[PDB]
Amino acid sequence: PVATNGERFPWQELRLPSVVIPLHYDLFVHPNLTSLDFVASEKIEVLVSNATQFIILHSKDLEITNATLQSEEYMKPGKELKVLSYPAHEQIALLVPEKLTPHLKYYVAMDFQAKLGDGFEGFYKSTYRTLGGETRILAVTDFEPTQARMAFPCFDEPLFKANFSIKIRRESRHIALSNMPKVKTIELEGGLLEDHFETTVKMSTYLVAYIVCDFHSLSGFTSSGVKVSIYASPDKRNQTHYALQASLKLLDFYEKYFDIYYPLSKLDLIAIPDFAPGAMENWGLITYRETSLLFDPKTSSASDKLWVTRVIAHELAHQWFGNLVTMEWWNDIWLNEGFAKYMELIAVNATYPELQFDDYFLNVCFEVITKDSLNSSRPISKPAETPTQIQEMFDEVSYNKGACILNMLKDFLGEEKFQKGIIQYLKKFSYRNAKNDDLWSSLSNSLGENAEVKEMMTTWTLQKGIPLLVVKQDGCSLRLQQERFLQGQERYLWHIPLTYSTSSSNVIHRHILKSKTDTLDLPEKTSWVKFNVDSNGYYIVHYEGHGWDQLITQLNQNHTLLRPKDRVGLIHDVFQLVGAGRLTLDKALDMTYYLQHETSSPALLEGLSYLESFYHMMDRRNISDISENLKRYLLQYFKPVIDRQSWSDKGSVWDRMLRSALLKLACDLNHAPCIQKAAELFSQWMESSGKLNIPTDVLKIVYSVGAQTTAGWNYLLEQYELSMSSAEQNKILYALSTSKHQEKLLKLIELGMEGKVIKTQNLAALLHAIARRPKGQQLAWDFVRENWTHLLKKFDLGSYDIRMIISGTTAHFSSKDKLQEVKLFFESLEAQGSHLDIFQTVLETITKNIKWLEKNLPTLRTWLMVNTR
């Protein structure tokens, strides 16, 4: 059946017919940034394979005002077309006056027009503030996955690749950028200019990009000769120096490591003021939030440098993983994002081992594990339909899990072989698509005894959840039993590569597992064993018997005898098993004693995290007596290291991150001295009128302290609008989130709604920040629940924005009462609401919360009191 105002639709499927295959777009956009809209024409060189009457492609909010098919053989210029718009599938069918013929090349041509978008999607309008307080406008695209069609009509599936020839018309006040380099710029009649860009290589629609704006750049060349340029508001060209250095080191590494050159003459990276994702891998023109690309030493901290390094690396890696080789469809999106998420590790560990991103990467893995230990989780690879569904596909799973099961795989196979694995894969599908199975098939084949790695990774990508491996030790035999891990089913098995160590030799014993159960014998009775070394593998281990107690003693006697990743891992698994019911809370809490001997910031920081977390559970909930004791326990223990910390920025990355960590905890716990220090720095900074320089590492801290007085918080807010640093602003915003006055918080949320002072793009993060504080957890929940309508105007569901605006304000709940209001709110969301897999997850998570409490609350109380004594 069909629409719009009559007639019927030749196609009842939201996928496009393979019959009409596109080979080339000729695309021309004439935007106006006063008019705030664009006119455009396109020209598509199709090729039919089966004769047909109609031609089917995507379009969304596009007014089409001319449609013609032309002929190469057949019909000279130019037969007219009958345009049929079926919005429910964001499609339009073309009607021909005569059957088309197989095996020949046609030309589809349309003129179309629209206003620039309001969103962060399609061909939208963004603004920024100048050093002089001027507000300026730019026009910009963001297409992944299904918004390419909101800009120009086209065959908008990742498989229909093509060459794109893009022409942009613009006033002289502006520049035009697009994926490719710029051939010529002809001056049109009355002043207006027109830019012609190099025809692209073959590539999917979601990767087309074009921008008009008046940014300035910083250019440089890679050893292999690409012109990397950094782009950003004119008053921000100084923040773009690091982006350049890194881009460069990083593209070099990639071309070498992948052994495949970056195809394009130049690569661009631009800092977009209003930008929803963190960044976008548009071939040859990658877009970034300012916080993901800009860096100013006066204002950007270590973690900052690390973050932007990360994302720059993550995005260059896409030029290969996704760009050059694209997953065939959205179910295997993980192929792009999981592989890119991983390569981050390799390249950054490669080019910047001083960031020690290695000791970090695990966090990626853990944090997903937290989400993959619920029934409401899913497989890395899963089928996808509605645009919305697809948007959901961009999550912690496709990213982190996919990235985690890759580093695990790499461990089993070895870098040498693994690296070889990918150079093959990439080279094989250069400039084309590839399937889920394709990856594995090309990795596992890097006689005649056969790499069956397939079967293995196949159980990983195709079933929900994560494995828990319990081990029993009776002298010299170990009972390895596997199960699905859950946080308080049947029918799951994993070809799960095991690893472990023994007290004696610190040598690594490997051994694969595929049967539900198996046993193994130990060449010498031993003290303790430790499965999953360096935590390089995607599963949990439980130690029944004295297995846990042994390892914990070891930790108190001589922890160095344990891998600092094993140490880090043990801490993870211990605390996770408490939730898993397998353990009692005192055992974990007890491990956390040896921490006064721990110097590995990774482990030390993890440890504290769990401690610091319970404090925040206790605090939200009114639960005074425990939060107050846990506060006292933290200030008391750990006081040595806490007292050692400097209000400077000296030391390695981990060193500075640990400082920020500690000094924060201290001040967040009202530690008399520390907060005096901060309050002083702030009062100097304010009364000196910005002049004083607060070290970037205590910056967020000082600001948030100073934020408690009405004087400060008002100066911080005004200072916010005036800041030329996204990073500072970021930290200021947080600092404004630490106020105790409801109205003050409410203000922020409104200012973020308005989107003038506080960019809408910050609304979720902001909400989330408030929701965490005791004071704001209600304010926040009221607001979302009360404004779901207007919010849904601002953002798509399910954008990461909506997805996070939902969980951010509710996932932290842990009472019966609230679990209802949420449960009931999600029922309510059921019109345009229903349905997001986040609805589920959030509930399951709130429940888990409630449980942990009743199950382990009292146990926490005593443990603390046992210390007081």
Ligand SMILES: *[C@@H]1O[C@H](CO)[C@@H](O[C@@H]2O[C@H](CO)[C@@H](O)[C@H](O)[C@H]2NC(C)=O)[C@H](O)[C@H]1NC(C)=O
């Ligand atoms: C968008 O339209 C604006 C109209 O505001 C154009 O600017 C006008 O252009 C004509 C011819 O160039 C001039 O006579 C007017 O004086 C301009 N108005 C202003 C405020 O200067 C502009 O050319 C268009 N932009 C593009 C590149 O299409």
Ligand SMILES: *[C@@H]1O[C@H](CO)[C@@H](O[C@@H]2O[C@H](CO)[C@@H](O)[C@H](O)[C@H]2NC(C)=O)[C@H](O)[C@H]1NC(C)=O
């Ligand atoms: C469209 O894109 C392709 C590349 O994606 C252009 O070139 C071919 O590129 C492949 C892969 O690098 C080379 O092996 C071929 O030698 C290239 N072919 C030719 C004839 O140059 C191709 O030229 C572009 N075609 C269009 C429609 O412009």
Ligand SMILES: *[C@@H]1O[C@H](CO)[C@@H](O)[C@H](O)[C@H]1NC(C)=O
């Ligand atoms: C990181 O890089 C170093 C070389 O700088 C290498 O020795 C190490 O194995 C790498 N780590 C991993 C696990 O990729």
Ligand SMILES: *[C@@H]1O[C@H](CO)[C@@H](O)[C@H](O)[C@H]1NC(C)=O
């Ligand atoms: C662990 O502790 C012992 C006893 O304090 C200490 O002598 C030693 O440095 C540690 N073991 C080694 C040599 O790593």
Ligand SMILES: N[C@@H](CCCC[NH3+])C(=O)O
């Ligand atoms: N491709 C993006 C994700 C954006 C998804 C929404 N535009 C990335 O590398 O993170």
Ligand SMILES: [Zn+2]
């Ligand atoms: Zn990505």
